[PDB]
Design a protein around this ligand. Sequence first.
Ligand SMILES: [Ca+2]
Ligand SMILES: [Cl-]
Length: 496
Amino acid sequence: QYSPNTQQGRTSIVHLFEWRWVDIALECERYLAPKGFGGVQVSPPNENVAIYNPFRPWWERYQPVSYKLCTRSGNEDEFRNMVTRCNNVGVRIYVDAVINHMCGNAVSAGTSSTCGSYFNPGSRDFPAVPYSGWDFNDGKCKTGSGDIENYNDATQVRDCRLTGLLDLALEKDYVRSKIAEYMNHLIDIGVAGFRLAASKHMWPGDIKAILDKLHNLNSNWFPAGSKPFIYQEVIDLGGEPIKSSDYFGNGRVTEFKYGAKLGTVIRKWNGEKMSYLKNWGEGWGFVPSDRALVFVDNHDNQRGHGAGGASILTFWDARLYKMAVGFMLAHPYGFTRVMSSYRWPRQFQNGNDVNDWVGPPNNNGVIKEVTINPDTTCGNDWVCEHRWRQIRNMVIFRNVVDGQPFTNWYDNGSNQVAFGRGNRGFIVFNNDDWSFSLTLQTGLPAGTYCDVISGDKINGNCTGIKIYVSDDGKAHFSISNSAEDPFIAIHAESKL
Ligand SMILES: [Ca+2]
Ligand SMILES: [Cl-]
């Protein structure tokens, strides 16, 4: 299940949040493939409720109306075209599957959907699937409000409505079959796996029953017997009766403790320091590496909207964000996901962003295209973190050192640390309030290496800092606490 199904030496996927199918298709060909990215997580491709108040928020896409591939990202033809073109260039597609529920029970009946499908939440009617009152958990939930009221009761967390979202009766074979019908359509089109949204709100056993109905990956692109990659969104920060380990039999799980703790450490909250990262991973109480999908931030918590709270690092905190992403991509733990966002007008009031609902860049509701500037950055308010030199080069760094052990660790007892990956790579960080100048053992072969954070290797030369490694593997590193990017990374492929 726990294999990404990515090509040979590609080790990361990027979340192109709210991107249109046509733009992702181009991106696969012009950037992702040549830069070594393993795949793309796309937003829910199935029809959702069109919410006008507020005006087309990002979260309207987590309120299904049917399973027709018709959204603001494009129609079914465009979706198929994207999967085909991306697959032909070796870049996988993973879809965000919303199968725990349909839309809000208080939503008005009518055809206010992204494809015009009629639906009536009030009478539990979704004819486009079709689903009726018999397919929901209204009679199974025991809370007085019908919604989830207390997370200390594992039963209502699964059988009741997540903040009013109509809850599907996943134990019924009919419902499980309608879900598999949807997912098998996607698999046969060519998708490589799925992100199961709101997995905590589904019984591990019901999920398994559904997965048992799924086909193997399309044999025109994947080896026979390939199973779809599955990563379940389970927010488990401890303290709840439900644990992410209960879902290991179905596939990997999102490790939300990862970004939450990395954030507090890099921000140096509660006296935490980078030197403590020496035993980062399972030692910190995280799930086993082979069951983890990791990330610094996700579409939900980058807007204070999810697990992690105020500690989560995002593109808004550029300097520290690049370091966190850098550390994540260099460290062997888990399978990594890079975030790619869009800017929205943040407006805090009493510590809360009142514009956290704002959807993707648009013209009267029509999502804007991703424009590429001559410096390779994006326009139309798309942030494109995956294109920042410091992040893109670390994505490549991870590919280069794949399989190499964690070694040659160093720390100053504070926030100046370094470590290597076998004899293929080495990275150094300075998060202290003073300069760093020291000769360290890198485990790398003698030679002149280009630092891939401050620059690039361009045929025989480096555009940024250059590092000289001696015969014994030692090299001198100098990082000022005033550096634009307070960290240096060099690897086998950046050697001159
Ligand atoms: Ca449920
Ligand atoms: Cl996620």
